[PDB]
Amino acid sequence: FFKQIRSDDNSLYSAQFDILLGTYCNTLNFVRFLELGLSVACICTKFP
């Protein structure tokens, strides 16, 4: 209950907001082992 005793009190014209001005994210880098140079040193072999 919030009666306006006399008439048209203040705080009936406020219009004050707050805005989410953006959003930022990142994309990981996915590396492969054979694209490196370190893999000259090994002979990888799949063996189930």
Add this chain to the structure above:
Amino acid sequence: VNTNCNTLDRLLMEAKAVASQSSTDTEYQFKRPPGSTEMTQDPCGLFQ
């Protein structure tokens, strides 16, 4: 600073924009006026 237990390396966030302590315009080294706007650096007041 109350967030002393909060931050890890608060050195970098307190090394930039200290306010001037002494008055830059008087004949002697008086204390700063209540509303001066100058800013200095304190490499010694940082490491004590």
Add this chain to the structure above:
Amino acid sequence: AMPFEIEVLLPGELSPAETSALQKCEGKIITFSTLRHRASLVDIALSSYYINGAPPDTLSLLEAYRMRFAAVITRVIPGKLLAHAIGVGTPTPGLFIQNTSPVDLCNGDYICLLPPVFGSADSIRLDSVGLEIVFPLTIPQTLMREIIAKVVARAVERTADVICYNGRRYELETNLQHRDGSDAAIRTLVLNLMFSINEGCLLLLALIPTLLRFPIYETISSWISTSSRLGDTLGTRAILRVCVFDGPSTVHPGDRTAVIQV
């Protein structure tokens, strides 16, 4: 002719326990050293009256309320704060005020300022930013001398009695032993009152003792100096007048009412 409108940018991070306390204080008087259009919440707080790096007494406020321009809080939104100057000549239309003083202002009085010379100030502690704001009391112009003198008189006796208005008496003691602090929070004023009336009741005998190395024309000048330099700080005057139209005549404490400019 426009009202000299001031804006104080309320910072963020004010916990809602404090924004909820800034609303209810709308119409209280605050002081500015210099008068601008954009102020800061620190230019209002208690840290402005610091003389010797320490909070002020009830004497330094008596000069501060004569050297710093005043301004009545007009309206507050959760984002900022808006206030109108009073002292200078400006047509500010609304200009209400809420009586913050333990007394009832009758209709058509004149209002002067006064620091909290008895008790604790119903101030506001903005802890999320680290400062406190104090608001001067609005006492009537006729009750000024009695209060400012009786507060010193009831202190000299403890170092060695009621106010009444609108037919309603107000016990100044408030039923507690305030003998600690209040006899030192007023120390600087009473101690400067001693040696300005203690010099007075002796130099008159010194001049002509038949009315009823110690220069004379130095102390006669050091007495008229002090007694006159203090003859304005304690003798303050009115700044506002409580006018009402089609409303109540008496305004109980804590309640707001409209005023005009002297």
Add this chain to the structure above:
Amino acid sequence: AMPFEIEVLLPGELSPAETSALQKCEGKIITFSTLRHRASLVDIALSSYYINGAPPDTLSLLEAYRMRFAAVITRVIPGKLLAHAIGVGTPTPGLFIQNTSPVDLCNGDYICLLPPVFGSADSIRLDSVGLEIVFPLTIPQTLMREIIAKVVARAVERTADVICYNGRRYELETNLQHRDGSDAAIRTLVLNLMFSINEGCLLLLAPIYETISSWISTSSRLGDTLGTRAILRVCVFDGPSTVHPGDRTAVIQV
């Protein structure tokens, strides 16, 4: 509604570098024994301050700078001098003065006009009609409540000179003629000394409310009656804080 502007018909018998001598004097104070719209140049000159055919002095001008209606010269056009009164009851929306003091003026101070006392006047002289105008030095209400102390500490030394301000020494003098005028300042001092002591001062020596309630009334009247009341307050809105001697500043009524 509208400020009390005063026009005073300048006489046309003046040199071009005499009407050009009044435009270096805008923002300065004048006085008026009577207050009307239409006036004459004789009324604000030193020839009018003469007490009885006799010139004035320090303790006689200070009995005139608190018995006349001070006014500010706003803008003089060739042939007519415009001015705005002060202590009347009407507002002056745009006002300003020129600092004639030898010291600095801060913001918010209280201005009190004092006759030239520093042994160096800035008088404007007119040989055309044979007049002379005196412009009083606007002094803050602190230094003004010490110059009034020293003038009486010398005036009573007669009937039996440096003052520090903002860290500097300032030297003054006086011309105490008119024994009537140097006696008239004694009776008020001794009266206020009489009317400040009461029966309650015995505790102060070794009711107490009554005593100080009577004493503040003496303290408020003493400095106002031996000197001049504060008449103007300097309130800069955008201008720099200090007003160096000679500059113009934004003043408001008190």
Add this chain to the structure above:
Amino acid sequence: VGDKLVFLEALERRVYQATRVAYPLIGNIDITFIMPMGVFQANSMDRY
């Protein structure tokens, strides 16, 4: 510079000239000194 393309500005001739404003890249720095006065080397192997 290095491996990057950067501007190289000096804004004290286009802006900040002929106006009464100080160029904000001229700053201050405060350094505290210490000197011992009246120390006697309270030993014998140290006074040679």
Add this chain to the structure above:
Amino acid sequence: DQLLGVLLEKAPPLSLLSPINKFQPEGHLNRVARAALLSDLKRRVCAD
């Protein structure tokens, strides 16, 4: 001949104009800055 004689009695020294040219911004230096500039003015005269 007169043009030389008139240009000569008008030209201030170089060692006195180059330093004050380095302190032109807000060329109404406060009491301290002129006192700190004069110490360099006395030195830049003897060096060249």
Add this chain to the structure above:
Amino acid sequence: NFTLTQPRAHVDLGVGYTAVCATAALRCPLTDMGNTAQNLFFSRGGVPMLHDNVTESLRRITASGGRLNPTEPLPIFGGLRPATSAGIARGQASVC
């Protein structure tokens, strides 16, 4: 008198540190690095000496060896400012 204001705002768009500073050159020193002792008689501190004349003599003996010291007639209220010199030579006087 016309006056023109304009509100603005800003915010940082990085996760780490974007700007960096480096004091590169040295202009003139702004304070002379000379001897100017401090006088503790400016402070209106706590417990005073007992015989006031001994205090008055200590203060004068101190003042007879420096130029930064209060104006001899002490005021009844104020900041005890020192006397402004007629001139200054090397720069702002740094206190020791």
Add this chain to the structure above:
Amino acid sequence: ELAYVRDGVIQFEVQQPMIARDGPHPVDQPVHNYMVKRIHKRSLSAAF
């Protein structure tokens, strides 16, 4: 409409890679960070 904003915000979100490892050691998992920061308000002014 800047004069009506209570406080505008921007949001971040960054992922972090990981490395598989041997024992004895608690196995790593992906971490996700979420950040928010607020805008500060300023102004300019001039006159004639």
